[PDB]
Design an enzyme around this catalytic site. Structure first.
Site, PDB file in Angstrom:
ATOM      1  N   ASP B  93       4.851  -3.255  10.474  1.00 38.57           N
ATOM      2  CA  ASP B  93       3.796  -4.027  11.098  1.00 38.57           C
ATOM      3  C   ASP B  93       4.366  -4.781  12.295  1.00 38.57           C
ATOM      4  O   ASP B  93       5.570  -5.024  12.394  1.00 38.57           O
ATOM      5  CB  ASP B  93       3.154  -4.972  10.085  1.00 38.57           C
ATOM      6  CG  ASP B  93       1.770  -5.433  10.510  1.00 38.57           C
ATOM      7  OD1 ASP B  93       1.279  -5.012  11.590  1.00 38.57           O
ATOM      8  OD2 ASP B  93       1.170  -6.232   9.761  1.00 38.57           O
ATOM      9  N   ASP B 269      -1.188  -0.394   2.143  1.00 39.80           N
ATOM     10  CA  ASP B 269      -0.053  -1.207   1.731  1.00 39.80           C
ATOM     11  C   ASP B 269      -0.610  -2.483   1.124  1.00 39.80           C
ATOM     12  O   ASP B 269      -1.678  -2.949   1.522  1.00 39.80           O
ATOM     13  CB  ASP B 269       0.829  -1.608   2.918  1.00 39.80           C
ATOM     14  CG  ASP B 269       0.213  -2.738   3.742  1.00 39.80           C
ATOM     15  OD1 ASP B 269      -0.603  -2.461   4.652  1.00 39.80           O
ATOM     16  OD2 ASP B 269       0.506  -3.909   3.439  1.00 39.80           O
ATOM     17  N   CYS B 307       1.296   5.696 -18.804  1.00 38.25           N
ATOM     18  CA  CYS B 307       2.176   5.638 -17.650  1.00 38.25           C
ATOM     19  C   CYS B 307       3.481   6.372 -17.919  1.00 38.25           C
ATOM     20  O   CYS B 307       4.087   6.230 -18.983  1.00 38.25           O
ATOM     21  CB  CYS B 307       2.471   4.173 -17.338  1.00 38.25           C
ATOM     22  SG  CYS B 307       3.604   3.948 -15.977  1.00 38.25           S
ATOM     23  N   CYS B 309       6.312   5.959 -16.188  1.00 38.79           N
ATOM     24  CA  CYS B 309       7.463   5.336 -15.556  1.00 38.79           C
ATOM     25  C   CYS B 309       8.576   5.051 -16.566  1.00 38.79           C
ATOM     26  O   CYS B 309       8.380   5.054 -17.789  1.00 38.79           O
ATOM     27  CB  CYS B 309       7.062   4.065 -14.803  1.00 38.79           C
ATOM     28  SG  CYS B 309       7.037   2.519 -15.759  1.00 38.79           S
ATOM     29  N   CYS B 312       7.926   2.135 -19.062  1.00 38.75           N
ATOM     30  CA  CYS B 312       7.056   2.433 -20.188  1.00 38.75           C
ATOM     31  C   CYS B 312       7.685   3.424 -21.150  1.00 38.75           C
ATOM     32  O   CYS B 312       7.273   3.492 -22.309  1.00 38.75           O
ATOM     33  CB  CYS B 312       5.696   2.903 -19.677  1.00 38.75           C
ATOM     34  SG  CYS B 312       4.793   1.571 -18.858  1.00 38.75           S
ATOM     35  N   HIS B 338       7.256  -0.850 -12.895  1.00 39.72           N
ATOM     36  CA  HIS B 338       6.053  -0.309 -13.511  1.00 39.72           C
ATOM     37  C   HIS B 338       4.857  -0.381 -12.564  1.00 39.72           C
ATOM     38  O   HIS B 338       4.101   0.583 -12.439  1.00 39.72           O
ATOM     39  CB  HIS B 338       5.709  -1.006 -14.826  1.00 39.72           C
ATOM     40  CG  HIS B 338       4.302  -0.734 -15.232  1.00 39.72           C
ATOM     41  ND1 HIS B 338       3.913   0.452 -15.827  1.00 39.72           N
ATOM     42  CD2 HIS B 338       3.168  -1.434 -14.996  1.00 39.72           C
ATOM     43  CE1 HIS B 338       2.598   0.438 -15.984  1.00 39.72           C
ATOM     44  NE2 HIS B 338       2.124  -0.691 -15.481  1.00 39.72           N
TER      45      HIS B 338
HETATM   46  C1  LIG Z   1       0.251 -13.517   2.702  1.00 37.56           C
HETATM   47  C2  LIG Z   1       0.027 -12.206   1.998  1.00 37.56           C
HETATM   48  C3  LIG Z   1       1.245 -11.710   1.267  1.00 37.56           C
HETATM   49  O1  LIG Z   1      -0.394 -11.229   2.948  1.00 37.56           O
HETATM   50  C4  LIG Z   1      -1.325 -10.349   2.326  1.00 37.56           C
HETATM   51  C5  LIG Z   1      -1.824 -11.125   1.098  1.00 37.56           C
HETATM   52  O2  LIG Z   1      -1.063 -12.332   1.086  1.00 37.56           O
HETATM   53  C6  LIG Z   1      -3.331 -11.303   1.327  1.00 37.56           C
HETATM   54  C7  LIG Z   1      -3.933 -12.652   0.968  1.00 37.56           C
HETATM   55  O3  LIG Z   1      -5.255 -12.348   0.587  1.00 37.56           O
HETATM   56  C8  LIG Z   1      -5.297 -11.015   0.083  1.00 37.56           C
HETATM   57  C9  LIG Z   1      -6.495 -10.301   0.650  1.00 37.56           C
HETATM   58  C10 LIG Z   1      -5.281 -11.036  -1.421  1.00 37.56           C
HETATM   59  O4  LIG Z   1      -4.094 -10.383   0.564  1.00 37.56           O
HETATM   60  O5  LIG Z   1      -3.530 -11.051   2.713  1.00 37.56           O
HETATM   61  C11 LIG Z   1      -2.537 -10.154   3.239  1.00 37.56           C
HETATM   62  C12 LIG Z   1      -3.106  -8.747   3.193  1.00 37.56           C
HETATM   63  N1  LIG Z   1      -4.171  -8.505   4.153  1.00 37.56           N
HETATM   64  C13 LIG Z   1      -3.966  -8.014   5.380  1.00 37.56           C
HETATM   65  N2  LIG Z   1      -2.738  -7.688   5.842  1.00 37.56           N
HETATM   66  C14 LIG Z   1      -2.892  -7.299   7.162  1.00 37.56           C
HETATM   67  C15 LIG Z   1      -1.975  -6.940   8.135  1.00 37.56           C
HETATM   68  C16 LIG Z   1      -2.450  -6.741   9.434  1.00 37.56           C
HETATM   69  N3  LIG Z   1      -1.504  -6.488  10.426  1.00 37.56           N
HETATM   70  C17 LIG Z   1      -1.923  -6.415  11.686  1.00 37.56           C
HETATM   71  N4  LIG Z   1      -1.042  -6.201  12.666  1.00 37.56           N
HETATM   72  N5  LIG Z   1      -3.233  -6.555  12.033  1.00 37.56           N
HETATM   73  C18 LIG Z   1      -4.250  -6.768  11.131  1.00 37.56           C
HETATM   74  O6  LIG Z   1      -5.415  -6.852  11.508  1.00 37.56           O
HETATM   75  C19 LIG Z   1      -3.816  -6.879   9.727  1.00 37.56           C
HETATM   76  C20 LIG Z   1      -4.738  -7.190   8.724  1.00 37.56           C
HETATM   77  C21 LIG Z   1      -4.257  -7.417   7.434  1.00 37.56           C
HETATM   78  N6  LIG Z   1      -4.919  -7.857   6.288  1.00 37.56           N
HETATM   79 ZN   LIG Z   2       4.914   2.123 -16.601  1.00 39.22          ZN
END
Ligand SMILES: CC1(C)O[C@H]2[C@@H](O1)[C@@]1(COC(C)(C)O1)O[C@@H]2CNc1nc2cc3nc(N)[nH]c(=O)c3cc2[nH]1
Ligand SMILES: [Zn+2]
Ligand SMILES: CC1(C)O[C@H]2[C@@H](O1)[C@@]1(COC(C)(C)O1)O[C@@H]2CNc1nc2cc3nc(N)[nH]c(=O)c3cc2[nH]1
Ligand SMILES: [Cl-]
Ligand SMILES: [Cl-]
Ligand SMILES: [Zn+2]
Lengths: 372, 372
Positions: B93, B269, B307, B309, B312, B338
């Protein structure tokens, strides 16, 4: 099939010996190093990785497992071997170290020791310690003793040792009265007596009269330093039966191990490779290094230039430096695997050099390079 | 030898596709899940374990590696692949998520974004982000964008998307002007536009005019919830070129992945399997469980009943419960292995069901059991 317990000495050089302990769950090559697995895990390593480094046996702890997850619970789940996935021998300490180290939590009497959490209470005694070790399914059971604090006056060292010898007889009788345990496990006695030759002799005599499968030198690695530890070993190890293993509890640094083997010790355990590995200390044949140090930030060499472990085959000091700095779990994993592999390679070099009649030269060469 | 980049679709069912991306460092089976390795490590796993679970590619992050250990440092050490010991493709990224999530640390302009640590300053721009990804040796380079915050007004979403499209062209030109990077890596553009169909269309049109090797749907997994995410995917994915991979950034839970594949997404991811694994959440075909719960303290079953893995195959819920309760590193290791294996098995079932023309039935059966 292997016997319950057989110790055979294949070669000797001075006081040093090399050989094998055969037990039902496997063979232990001696001199042996036991990785410590106090919480039913050798920290940061799968059991298969522990085995891949060369370990033949690991150490568990009655006291810690009694508290978490519980001895009866482990028995209900099939025993410690099944629970943690290590199918080879396990030696369990009896709790006698914690009788000393956690004494402020304790009420002690001739019957045993009750520990109070800082609020639940848990009792240990010769009978309960042996029972817990049975519930765990331990292969080498340690007698329930008291590790005498250091320093100790001669009077207090004598009183402590005498109680430990009474507890050793109670441990023997408890073990023998449980047929399944007596037929499948071994029992080691623990010599006490602090730094005093006459008390060490009385303790050895008492343990030999009771009779055990092996004999630990207890009451050392308690702050006394290497010169004093070696002085005590000089007179204490010859007091133990020659034809049974000699186990130095809690030792130690690589040079401690070498000098203890020179004094007749066959078995060792220590948290140093695991704990100090997680804290960034890596063992090398040129002495320990602290991988956190900025000098390693761009060092592409492996942790040690000769080490055969999987960590040194693949990753650089620079990468491990980054991981430890960052607090990454993989840093703990890699440091720990390397340090345990280093310890096992040390033991292998010790065994081979004794077998070949060149251990004295190995010890001198090891020290000259390690301390250069 | 494999090409720099080829994407081939082998089978389709509705909007869902399955196929392969061929790159110099390996083949990526799609739909693909990328374990997250932000600190140059997939937390608590050796790279060989990541591979053993079935991962074909992992995700790194320009922003985090810029700060620690440094991009130039990694280049001096031979690149990210050598540094961490993963020799297969890595997607990085660009930092555009951190442009949003760490915006309080930032000064942003049309030129780029400067981050100030809470005291060092670090700058990112289309040119510097692409350069860092080159220094890391990334195989799939992401354009430098801004993840628009959610919710966003139409005006602010438009202004943000328009800047991202200007930055996408600058990213394309920076990548193309570095011959070694242009010849050996791929470049993906990132669609923005928040939840607004007209802005998503303008963004897709701008990215297709520039031309990229793959197209990410950015600006989702930002708090919008599944119904809204699916609504945006419904109109947004068909706007992207059909013959190139579609990458949904940051998604997601197992049911998010299934529904996103039903809407034409090829790559994913998420930190959920790693991070929530360390926090005691295990994924199963019957839904997630929290292994810390007392109900697992004596449960001898594996984490999941089907699973395949290594975790498990060997260890019980009861043991892993104990490890996580105790804060033991092996608990994090086993939960993480896992969960990543579970995610890869999900992707394999998705790929196989699309190949066999039964993905719609798989999705319905998966949901019925997972949410039972
Ligand atoms: C801080 C942390 C680890 O990042 C994760 C996770 O918490 C969390 C917190 O809320 C949930 C939804 C549960 O996922 O949000 C992050 C995952 N969502 C996400 N990652 C992205 C990466 C991206 N990179 C770029 N360059 N541009 C984007 O528009 C973009 C959009 C994205 N949306
Ligand atoms: Zn497993
Ligand atoms: C708290 C912790 C992890 O225990 C280690 C280590 O720190 C530390 C702190 O000082 C050093 C020396 C460096 O080693 O001392 C512990 C290792 N010494 C040692 N372990 C023993 C275990 C024993 N068990 C029994 N039943 N009886 C004994 O007499 C006995 C003596 C022992 N001596
Ligand atoms: Cl430890
Ligand atoms: Cl994570
Ligand atoms: Zn090594």
């Amino acid at each position: 099939d292997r016997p319950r317990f057989s110790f055979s000495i294949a070669a000797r050089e001075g006081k040093a010996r090399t050989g094998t302990i055969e037990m039902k769950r496997g063979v232990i090559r001696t001199p042996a190093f036991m990785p410590v697995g106090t919480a039913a895990t050798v920290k940061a390593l799968k059991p298969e990785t522990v085995r891949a480094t060369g370990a033949d046996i690991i150490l568990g702890n009655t006291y810690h497992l009694m508290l978490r997850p519980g001895a009866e619970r482990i028995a209900k789940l099939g025993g410690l071997h099944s629970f943690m996935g290590w199918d080879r021998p396990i030696l369990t300490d009896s709790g006698g170290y914690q009788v000393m180290s956690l004494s402020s939590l304790t009420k002690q009497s001739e019957e045993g020791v009750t520990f109070k959490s800082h609020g639940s209470r848990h009792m240990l005694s010769p009978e309960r310690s042996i029972e817990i070790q049975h519930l765990l399914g331990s292969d080498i059971v340690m007698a329930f003793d008291e590790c005498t604090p250091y320093p100790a006056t001669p009077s207090r060292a004598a009183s402590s040792m005498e109680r430990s010898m009474r507890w050793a007889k109670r441990s023997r009788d408890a073990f023998d009265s449980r047929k399944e345990q007596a037929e499948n496990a071994a029992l080691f006695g623990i010599q006490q007596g602090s730094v005093f030759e006459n008390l060490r002799q009385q303790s050895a005599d008492a343990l030999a009269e009771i009779g055990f499968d092996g004999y630990a030198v207890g009451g050392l690695a308690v702050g006394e330093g290497q010169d004093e530890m070696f002085r005590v070993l000089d007179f204490s190890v010859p007091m133990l039966p020659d034809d049974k293993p000699h186990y130095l509890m809690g030792v130690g640094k690589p040079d401690d191990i070498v000098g203890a083997v020179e004094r007749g010790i066959d078995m060792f355990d220590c948290v140093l490779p695991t704990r100090s590995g997680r804290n960034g200390q890596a063992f090398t044949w040129d002495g320990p290094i602290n991988i956190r140090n900025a000098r390693f930030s761009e060092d592409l060499k492996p942790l040690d230039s000769e080490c055969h472990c999987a960590v040194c085959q693949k990753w650089s000091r620079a990468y491990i430096h980054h991981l430890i700095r960052a607090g990454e779990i993989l840093g703990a994993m890699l440091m720990t695997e390397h340090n345990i592999a280093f310890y096992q390679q040390l033991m292998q070099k010790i065994r081979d050099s004794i077998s070949e009649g060149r251990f004295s030269q190995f010890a001198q060469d090891f020290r000259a390079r390690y301390f250069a």
